[PDB]
Design a protein around this nucleic acid. Structure first.
Ligand SMILES: [Mg+2]
Ligand SMILES: [Mg+2]
Ligand SMILES: [Mg+2]
Ligand SMILES: [Mg+2]
Ligand SMILES: [Mg+2]
Ligand SMILES: [Mg+2]
Ligand SMILES: [Mg+2]
Ligand SMILES: [Mg+2]
Ligand SMILES: [Mg+2]
Ligand SMILES: [Mg+2]
Ligand SMILES: [Mg+2]
Ligand SMILES: [Mg+2]
Ligand SMILES: [Mg+2]
Ligand SMILES: [Mg+2]
Ligand SMILES: [Mg+2]
Ligand SMILES: [Mg+2]
Ligand SMILES: [Mg+2]
Ligand SMILES: [Mg+2]
Ligand SMILES: [Mg+2]
Ligand SMILES: [Mg+2]
Ligand SMILES: [Mg+2]
Ligand SMILES: [Mg+2]
Ligand SMILES: [Mg+2]
Ligand SMILES: [Mg+2]
Ligand SMILES: [Mg+2]
Ligand SMILES: [Mg+2]
Ligand SMILES: [Mg+2]
Ligand SMILES: [Mg+2]
Ligand SMILES: [Mg+2]
Ligand SMILES: [Mg+2]
Ligand SMILES: [Mg+2]
Ligand SMILES: [Mg+2]
Ligand SMILES: [Mg+2]
Ligand SMILES: [Mg+2]
Ligand SMILES: [Mg+2]
Ligand SMILES: [Mg+2]
Ligand SMILES: [Mg+2]
Ligand SMILES: [Mg+2]
Ligand SMILES: [Mg+2]
Ligand SMILES: [Mg+2]
Ligand SMILES: [Mg+2]
Ligand SMILES: [Mg+2]
Ligand SMILES: [Mg+2]
Ligand SMILES: [Mg+2]
Ligand SMILES: [Mg+2]
Ligand SMILES: [Mg+2]
Ligand SMILES: [Mg+2]
Ligand SMILES: [Mg+2]
Ligand SMILES: [Mg+2]
Ligand SMILES: [Mg+2]
Ligand SMILES: [Mg+2]
Ligand SMILES: [Mg+2]
Ligand SMILES: [Mg+2]
Ligand SMILES: [Mg+2]
Ligand SMILES: [Mg+2]
Ligand SMILES: [Mg+2]
Ligand SMILES: [Mg+2]
Ligand SMILES: [Mg+2]
Ligand SMILES: [Mg+2]
Ligand SMILES: [Mg+2]
Ligand SMILES: [Mg+2]
Ligand SMILES: [Mg+2]
Ligand SMILES: [Mg+2]
Ligand SMILES: [Mg+2]
Ligand SMILES: [Mg+2]
Ligand SMILES: [Mg+2]
Ligand SMILES: [Mg+2]
Ligand SMILES: [Mg+2]
Ligand SMILES: [Mg+2]
Ligand SMILES: [Mg+2]
Ligand SMILES: [Mg+2]
Ligand SMILES: [Mg+2]
Ligand SMILES: [Mg+2]
Ligand SMILES: [Mg+2]
Lengths: 101, 62, 45, 77, 23, 94
RNA sequence: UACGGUGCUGAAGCAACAAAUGCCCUGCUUCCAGGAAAAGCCUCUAAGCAUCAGGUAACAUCAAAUCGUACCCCAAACCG
RNA sequence: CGAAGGUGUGCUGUGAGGCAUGCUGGAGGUAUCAGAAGUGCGAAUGCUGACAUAAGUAACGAUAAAGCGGGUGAAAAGCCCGCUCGCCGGAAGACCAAGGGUUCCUGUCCAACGUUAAUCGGGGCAGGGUGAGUCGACCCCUAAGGCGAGGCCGAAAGGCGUAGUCGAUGGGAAACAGGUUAAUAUUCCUGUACUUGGUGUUACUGCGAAGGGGGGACGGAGAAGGCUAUGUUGGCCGGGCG
RNA sequence: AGGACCGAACCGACUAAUGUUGAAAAAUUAGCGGAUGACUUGUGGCUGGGGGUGAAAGGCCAAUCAAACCGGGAGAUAGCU
RNA sequence: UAAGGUGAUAUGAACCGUUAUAACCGGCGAUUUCCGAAUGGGGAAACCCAGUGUGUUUCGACACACUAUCAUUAACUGAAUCCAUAGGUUAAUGAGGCGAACCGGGGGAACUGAAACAUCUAAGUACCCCGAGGAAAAGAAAUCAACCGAGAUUCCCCCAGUAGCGGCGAGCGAACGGGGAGCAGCCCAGAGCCUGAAUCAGUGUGUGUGUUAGUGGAAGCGUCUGGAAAGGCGCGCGAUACAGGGUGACAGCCCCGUACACAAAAAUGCACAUGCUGUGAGCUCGAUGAGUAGGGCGGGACACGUGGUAUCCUGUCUGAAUAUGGGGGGACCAUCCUCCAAGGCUAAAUACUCCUGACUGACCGAUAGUGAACCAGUACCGUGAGGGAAAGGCGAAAAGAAC
């Protein structure tokens, strides 16, 4: 897998191309959840137990993993991340300027 | 934990099995009632009594 | 009137049960025709 | 069954043809008897479900050679 | 829920003649 | 002598009902939910050994499970066994 | 007193008659169309076993397992 | 900056047709010349789905029969409660086997089901509920019969059948009374019991069968006697003086 | 005493009416025959298709019988619609 | 391999895990309830009842293992019987059951066509049964041919719808010969003497190859439309990769890939390098498959229906020679030609797909394609064999409508 959990990504399409943010957790099918960018206004119908109030909450919903790319801060662009065997231990590296994360 | 469970004697593995079973019975009688919030302990003791019985089965006869 | 199915599970299992199918020769081809057909219950029993 | 215990003569099938060539199916049955054969190397009697050509082939050979062939064929004679 | 209790109409059983026949 | 892991495997639950509570108070009978293939002597030995309580006699029956309809597909709940273990005269066990 | 209940007390509690297809009856009388089988159970012994085992009159002590026990059952629940 | 498809119009072709466009639709379509066909529907008492028609017509399923008040609700002819009325009473009452399989009981909802309404239900949902030494199966024993090691027979399959082994609707040990649950009770609780086995202790000595024998062990009809269930009458106790 | 008598259970099914797309793919009502026998019925067994069984009607064999039902030969064949 | 997982409707609490004992995937093990050939006895499949031996026992009993039937052989025994014999007691060694089609064998129809029907056809077809294998059968001339010559078997194309068979009707229909695929030949019928060399079968160490996890894997931006660009506009780059599938509208350059280049501790199919255990090639002399070939009768297969009918198989009766002998050469006879039955074994080409992968479709796109795009041989019907449906689509993402 390329787009891991920690790294600040920049999106490439959607209603908010040109925005960016961190990554919270990646789902199974390949839909990551980014730090508050493709937010949705989920209406909430309440519950007596379980402690939920009930209202419009503007949480974040998913965005597909082939629309995010790692924010190459050494140039400011987005950059496709390739892989390399180092010390017997496969790690990531960029393509523009070729540094290793 | 089977690395250390190889490194016990046969009767010590038997007694480990029996005390694991007493833990499993007390967790069973607790989770029958409203007495369990740590729910993963059931799965933990069940997998570990499987491991202890496996190591009995591979010691005795081999 | 008196209809033509007076159910009795003794006669039912004794004439259409699995062992009463398994005993004969074209009874074992009855069970092997339903397994290839893939049915839910092979016989009554 | 109807088997010559010496020569293995099974009942074969054929057609009764009529004079007007109407055909029907029939079973040629081998001529069987139950003869009791005297051996010497066992010094006793032994029965056989023999045919008449079986009695003639045992007349030709001798019964002990035929019993050797029958036990090599593997049957309780 | 949604039971949808609409099974197909298997209706026709048999017949007979049973009529005064012109002959 | 019964196997100790067998006596640890037999008892599965207690039972929680109005009849169970009234039978616990008026007759000193605990009501248990036991394994499917248990028997009377094994249940009596297990209830004397695990809870460490003197036990007179045991009364077992087999509850037939219901047939429910979850969603739209029909299904069978699993049968089990219920056991009225009485206790000795003047002996507490919760 | 939650009108649903619930606890303590509680007298008389006999006699005569009638009487069944049920019991004695797996009996008795009678007829011919001549009216299941094997184990329980009682008893005799051959083998053998030789005062060992066993048997039987007790006496104490332990057990009696598993399964069906809801409900309808001349029907709104079985067969139509 | 809107494809197929759908719906409208206008033009045009000798006809099957074609083109342009407005609306709906929201992602595919395909010139030209050739090629291959599951290539054209109005009829087959054609096949499947949908919707008519008769028509808001027949019918609402025993000619045992209902009426009133009070409760519940948004809503009572049908539900709950009370008061009357009617019907069965060798059944339209009670206990079962076969059979069904949670319909039994509580709480909740009335979408569908109920030949109508429904707060009701044998409907949906969640929970509860069946307690056996003595009842019945399981067990021991066999009937008609079934399978049937060997065997006999049979192109093969297999058919028959002995030892056997299964097969109840029959034979074989033992529990009744009273009380409780919303739901079990000859099962739970109280009282009083009884049966078959092991074990061990005391006394006594011929025990033992795959056997021999007794018994188990047996029809139809009738007739009488003794009784009992059970009822009626009196007494006795308690209530009553309309 | 009896394949005796009158008559309920129980077995039937003789007449009439009602239904006949019914309450019911043979029933209800009012009468009717037998009702200690060649009776009737519970439960289990047996006989298999040119075969069974039949107090005999070509009847009955799962609402079907001058030769059942299910699959296969099989898209039988059809000078016919 | 690994930073994310605790299978799906299916969210939730509870957790585990981030440098490699979380999870995921492959190899090998262990557990493997009950029914099922069921195999300890039984049986209304998923249940009841055991007995023997070994243990432990708080004497209440639990735990373990065993126990079917036949075929073969081994020992023990052991009847009427005298030895003996059957029989019985164990012991091992195997089989049993399932499975689509293909193969060989044992049985074997009828509708139908003949414009009717009986010979015939349908057809040795459907079907029943037995047996074995990944192939099976056949197979090494008692075969052809024609005075030349070929030198197993099987399969394909021709010969040829010819020669024939035929109530001479309906129809059935070769072969000789030639082109191809592939080509492999040996042994017991028995003794001496070389005396272990060719050889195959079975058991193993090493190489290589293939499978069961996998890893790397190129190259793009700015703008207008738009909800969103993969679209239009301009401008670049990769390409042994422009096969494909996604991605908020059509992407070689966003992702997964493919091309290519590698990787397996372990089991492993195979080519073997080759050790081990059985195994003997090799030489000479001899032997040349008997109730058999033929014959009478009755049938069957060859294209061949008794016809002038060769040849092959046998239900029955019969019955030789045996290398100077015999079979055949399409009645039969004489010369000639050729070949040596009555005992075996044998690879390949060929038939098939219940399956396991990759790939393609002038194949279908929900009344189609399997019956089945879905929790289908399910609901349901039938006592039972069996019969047997309907039923896909919100969106891009539930943002599934707070109030
Ligand atoms: Mg993308
Ligand atoms: Mg069925
Ligand atoms: Mg014929
Ligand atoms: Mg019980
Ligand atoms: Mg009851
Ligand atoms: Mg538009
Ligand atoms: Mg189109
Ligand atoms: Mg259009
Ligand atoms: Mg498309
Ligand atoms: Mg027309
Ligand atoms: Mg039409
Ligand atoms: Mg209509
Ligand atoms: Mg209308
Ligand atoms: Mg009208
Ligand atoms: Mg009118
Ligand atoms: Mg009306
Ligand atoms: Mg009514
Ligand atoms: Mg009315
Ligand atoms: Mg009222
Ligand atoms: Mg009313
Ligand atoms: Mg009255
Ligand atoms: Mg009643
Ligand atoms: Mg229900
Ligand atoms: Mg009720
Ligand atoms: Mg209720
Ligand atoms: Mg309403
Ligand atoms: Mg209604
Ligand atoms: Mg209900
Ligand atoms: Mg009793
Ligand atoms: Mg018995
Ligand atoms: Mg018998
Ligand atoms: Mg038999
Ligand atoms: Mg046998
Ligand atoms: Mg009985
Ligand atoms: Mg009895
Ligand atoms: Mg009740
Ligand atoms: Mg009790
Ligand atoms: Mg006796
Ligand atoms: Mg009598
Ligand atoms: Mg009295
Ligand atoms: Mg009085
Ligand atoms: Mg007065
Ligand atoms: Mg009379
Ligand atoms: Mg009447
Ligand atoms: Mg009378
Ligand atoms: Mg027939
Ligand atoms: Mg007639
Ligand atoms: Mg009929
Ligand atoms: Mg016929
Ligand atoms: Mg047709
Ligand atoms: Mg045909
Ligand atoms: Mg999940
Ligand atoms: Mg068994
Ligand atoms: Mg038994
Ligand atoms: Mg068995
Ligand atoms: Mg014919
Ligand atoms: Mg004909
Ligand atoms: Mg014809
Ligand atoms: Mg072969
Ligand atoms: Mg040869
Ligand atoms: Mg020559
Ligand atoms: Mg990769
Ligand atoms: Mg790449
Ligand atoms: Mg779109
Ligand atoms: Mg020769
Ligand atoms: Mg010879
Ligand atoms: Mg001969
Ligand atoms: Mg001959
Ligand atoms: Mg000849
Ligand atoms: Mg001949
Ligand atoms: Mg010849
Ligand atoms: Mg010639
Ligand atoms: Mg559609
Ligand atoms: Mg379909």
């Amino acid at each position: 897998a390329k787009i891991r959990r920690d790294d600040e990504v920049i999106v490439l399409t959607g209603k908010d191309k040109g925005k960016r943010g961190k990554v919270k957790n990646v789902l199974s099918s390949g839909k990551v959840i980014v730090e508050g960018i493709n937010l949705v206004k989920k209406h909430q119908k309440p519950v007596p137990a379980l402690n939920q109030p009930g209202g419009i909450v503007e949480k974040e919903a998913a965005i597909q993993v082939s629309n995010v790319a790692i924010f190459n801060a050494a140039t400011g662009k987005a950059d496709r991340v390739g892989f390399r065997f180092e010390d017997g231990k496969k790690v990531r590296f960029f393509k523009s300027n070729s540094e290793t994360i | 934990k089977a690395k250390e469970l190889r490194e016990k004697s046969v009767e010590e593995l038997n007694t480990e099995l029996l005390n694991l079973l007493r833990e499993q019975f007390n967790l069973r009688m607790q989770a029958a009632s409203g007495q369990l919030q740590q729910s993963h302990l059931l799965k933990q003791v069940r997998r570990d009594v499987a491991r202890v019985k496996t190591l009995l089965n591979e010691k005795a006869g081999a | 009137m008196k209809r033509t199915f007076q159910p009795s599970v003794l006669k039912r299992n004794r004439s259409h049960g699995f062992r009463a199918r398994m005993a004969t020769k074209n009874g074992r081809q009855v069970l092997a025709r339903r397994r290839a057909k893939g049915r839910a219950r092979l016989t009554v029993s | 069954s109807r088997v010559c215990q010496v020569t293995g003569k099974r009942p074969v099938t054929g057609n009764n043809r009529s004079h007007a060539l109407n055909a029907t199916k029939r079973r040629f049955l081998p001529n069987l008897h139950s003869h009791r054969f005297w051996v010497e190397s066992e010094k006793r009697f032994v029965t056989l479900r023999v045919s008449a050509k079986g009695m003639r082939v045992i007349d030709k050979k001798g019964i002990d050679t035929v019993l050797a062939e029958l036990r090599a064929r593997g049957e309780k004679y | 829920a949604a039971a949808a209790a609409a099974a197909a109409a298997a209706a026709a059983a048999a017949a007979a003649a049973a009529a005064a026949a012109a002959a | 002598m019964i196997r100790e892991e067998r006596l640890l495997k037999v008892l599965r639950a207690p039972h929680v009902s109005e009849k169970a509570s009234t039978a616990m108070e008026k007759s000193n009978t605990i009501v248990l939910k036991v394994a499917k293939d248990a028997t009377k002597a094994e249940i009596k030995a297990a209830v004397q050994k695990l809870f460490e309580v003197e036990v007179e006699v045991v009364n077992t029956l087999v509850v037939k499970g219901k047939v429910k309809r979850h969603g739209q597909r029909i299904g069978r709940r699993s049968d089990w066994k219920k056991a009225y273990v009485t206790l000795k005269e003047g002996q507490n066990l919760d």
